[PDB]
Structures are given as C-alpha cells and as structure tokens.
Design an enzyme around this catalytic site. Sequence first.
Site, PDB file in Angstrom:
ATOM      1  CG  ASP A   9      22.080  54.778   0.211  1.00  0.00           C
ATOM      2  OD1 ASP A   9      21.867  55.391   1.273  1.00  0.00           O
ATOM      3  OD2 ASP A   9      23.119  54.117   0.004  1.00  0.00           O
ATOM      4  CG  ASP A  53      41.672  45.752  -0.798  1.00  0.00           C
ATOM      5  OD1 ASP A  53      42.228  46.408  -1.703  1.00  0.00           O
ATOM      6  OD2 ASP A  53      41.386  44.540  -0.914  1.00  0.00           O
ATOM      7  CG  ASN A  86      26.631  54.341   4.175  1.00  0.00           C
ATOM      8  OD1 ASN A  86      26.135  53.331   3.676  1.00  0.00           O
ATOM      9  ND2 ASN A  86      26.006  55.513   4.189  1.00  0.00           N
ATOM     10  CB  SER A 102      22.818  53.939   3.988  1.00  0.00           C
ATOM     11  OG  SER A 102      23.406  55.035   3.316  1.00  0.00           O
ATOM     12  CG  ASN A 124      23.953  58.893   3.197  1.00  0.00           C
ATOM     13  OD1 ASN A 124      24.553  58.069   3.886  1.00  0.00           O
ATOM     14  ND2 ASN A 124      24.387  60.136   3.026  1.00  0.00           N
ATOM     15  CD  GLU A 182      32.490  62.637   5.500  1.00  0.00           C
ATOM     16  OE1 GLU A 182      31.271  62.705   5.767  1.00  0.00           O
ATOM     17  OE2 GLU A 182      32.936  62.382   4.356  1.00  0.00           O
ATOM     18  CG  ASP A 242      26.984  58.755   6.026  1.00  0.00           C
ATOM     19  OD1 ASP A 242      27.058  57.571   5.639  1.00  0.00           O
ATOM     20  OD2 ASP A 242      27.011  59.731   5.244  1.00  0.00           O
TER      21      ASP A 242
HETATM   22  O1  LIG Z   1      19.065  64.551  -3.931  1.00  0.00           O
HETATM   23  C1  LIG Z   1      18.175  64.489  -2.974  1.00  0.00           C
HETATM   24  C2  LIG Z   1      18.439  65.080  -1.746  1.00  0.00           C
HETATM   25 BR1  LIG Z   1      20.062  66.006  -1.508  1.00  0.00          BR
HETATM   26  C3  LIG Z   1      17.497  64.991  -0.709  1.00  0.00           C
HETATM   27  C4  LIG Z   1      16.273  64.331  -0.911  1.00  0.00           C
HETATM   28  C5  LIG Z   1      15.349  64.225   0.073  1.00  0.00           C
HETATM   29  C6  LIG Z   1      15.696  64.121   1.470  1.00  0.00           C
HETATM   30  C7  LIG Z   1      14.805  64.613   2.429  1.00  0.00           C
HETATM   31  C8  LIG Z   1      15.104  64.496   3.788  1.00  0.00           C
HETATM   32 BR2  LIG Z   1      13.962  65.188   5.092  1.00  0.00          BR
HETATM   33  C9  LIG Z   1      16.254  63.854   4.197  1.00  0.00           C
HETATM   34  O2  LIG Z   1      16.518  63.734   5.461  1.00  0.00           O
HETATM   35  C10 LIG Z   1      17.129  63.346   3.259  1.00  0.00           C
HETATM   36 BR3  LIG Z   1      18.677  62.500   3.872  1.00  0.00          BR
HETATM   37  C11 LIG Z   1      16.854  63.458   1.894  1.00  0.00           C
HETATM   38  C12 LIG Z   1      13.877  64.241  -0.251  1.00  0.00           C
HETATM   39  C13 LIG Z   1      13.279  65.446  -0.611  1.00  0.00           C
HETATM   40  C14 LIG Z   1      11.916  65.497  -0.892  1.00  0.00           C
HETATM   41  C15 LIG Z   1      11.144  64.349  -0.798  1.00  0.00           C
HETATM   42  C16 LIG Z   1      11.728  63.143  -0.428  1.00  0.00           C
HETATM   43  C17 LIG Z   1      13.087  63.079  -0.137  1.00  0.00           C
HETATM   44  S1  LIG Z   1      13.769  61.496   0.316  1.00  0.00           S
HETATM   45  O3  LIG Z   1      14.734  61.245  -0.730  1.00  0.00           O
HETATM   46  O4  LIG Z   1      14.351  61.648   1.637  1.00  0.00           O
HETATM   47  O5  LIG Z   1      12.639  60.586   0.280  1.00  0.00           O
HETATM   48  C18 LIG Z   1      16.021  63.746  -2.150  1.00  0.00           C
HETATM   49  C19 LIG Z   1      16.966  63.831  -3.179  1.00  0.00           C
HETATM   50 BR4  LIG Z   1      16.611  63.059  -4.853  1.00  0.00          BR
END
Ligand SMILES: O=C1C(Br)=CC(=C(c2cc(Br)c(O)c(Br)c2)c2ccccc2S(=O)(=O)O)C=C1Br
Length: 129
Positions: A48, A101, A59, A50, A46, A35, A52
């Site tokens: 979503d 749980d 989370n 959120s 993440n 982790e 970590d």
């Molecule tokens: O499966 C995924 C995974 Br893996 C990563 C991401 C992203 C991302 C970019 C950054 Br920078 C970051 O820090 C994180 Br955490 C995620 C991302 C990439 C391009 C545009 C917007 C995002 S967005 O989702 O962040 O808006 C989107 C998906 Br779908």
Amino acid sequence: KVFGRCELAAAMKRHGLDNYRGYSLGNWVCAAKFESNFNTQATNRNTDGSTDYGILQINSRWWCNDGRTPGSRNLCNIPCSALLSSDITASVNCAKKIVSDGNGMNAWVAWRNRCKGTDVQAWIRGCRL
Ligand SMILES: O=C1C(Br)=CC(=C(c2cc(Br)c(O)c(Br)c2)c2ccccc2S(=O)(=O)O)C=C1Br
Ligand SMILES: O=C1C(Br)=CC(=C(c2cc(Br)c(O)c(Br)c2)c2ccccc2S(=O)(=O)O)C=C1Br
Ligand code: NA
C-alpha cells in the site's frame, strides 16, 4: 541492535508489557521474532506504500509518521524513525497504544498467524525474568 530473545523479554518487562491488556509476555517476544527477527533497525515497505518500522514492524499508515505515506494518522504521535532505536521504549509505548483498543495484537499479521493459538510461554523458556 539485534536483541537476544531473553534479552528482549527482560527489556519489555522493564516497561510493563507483561500481561498488558491481558497479553502474556511471550506473545510480544513471538511477535517481535517473526516481524523483525529481533532487529530494532528493520524497515520493510508494504504494497500500500506504507512502511513498517522497528522490532515490532509498526506501520506508517496508522501509527507513526514517516513523511511519505498518504493519509497517515500517526496514532502513536511519533516519527517512525524513533521506532528504530536500540532503546525499545518508543516501540513499546506505540505497541501499547495499538493494543489499547481495536483488534488488539491482531494488528500484527505475524502474531495472528505464528503466535495466536499456541503456547507462547515457550518463547520465554530459560529467560531470567
Ligand atoms: O503482492 C505484491 C507483492 Br508481495 C509485491 C509487489 C511488488 C513489490 C516490489 C518491491 Br521491489 C517491493 O519492495 C515491494 Br514492498 C513490493 C511489486 C512487484 C512488481 C512490480 C511492482 C511492485 S510494487 O507493488 O512495489 O509497485 C506487488 C504485489 Br501486487
Ligand atoms: O513495475 C515496477 C517494477 Br517491475 C519495479 C518497481 C520497483 C523497483 C524496481 C527495481 Br529495477 C528495483 O531494483 C527495485 Br528495489 C524496485 C519499486 C517497487 C516498489 C517501490 C519502489 C520501486 S522503484 O525502485 O521503482 O522506485 C516498481 C514498478 Br511500478
Ligand atoms: Na506516515
């Protein structure tokens, strides 16, 4: 703080994590390795929205409050900031709440994919415990 493997095992055992809910100590060390690479200050967002936090990457959607996660429950009743301390107490207590749980240590994807179904006792090899 970046802990050593055995250093972390010993600190966890001083909080009774060994065999908590039936999970031997190596499970928690293995989880922490994958982790956070043993770094108490690790934070990672993440998809979503959120984040970590800490050595066990707990989370903010369910477990701790970081003030920016819609619909957060804060089931550990702790600011996520508390999980970044060099003192692992808050992370251990929240991990115990998570594992009390539900799906147990399956709450950590890294545990499920890297640790479950292996001889996790290897992770405490050579540690004075
Ligand atoms: O499966 C995924 C995974 Br893996 C990563 C991401 C992203 C991302 C970019 C950054 Br920078 C970051 O820090 C994180 Br955490 C995620 C991302 C990439 C391009 C545009 C917007 C995002 S967005 O989702 O962040 O808006 C989107 C998906 Br779908
Ligand atoms: O479609 C996109 C694309 Br592409 C990129 C980004 C981001 C981003 C962009 C850059 Br550039 C960067 O250096 C970093 Br780090 C993250 C981003 C991703 C997750 C969270 C916050 C941002 S935020 O930074 O945009 O708030 C969001 C959307 Br939506
Ligand atoms: Na939150």
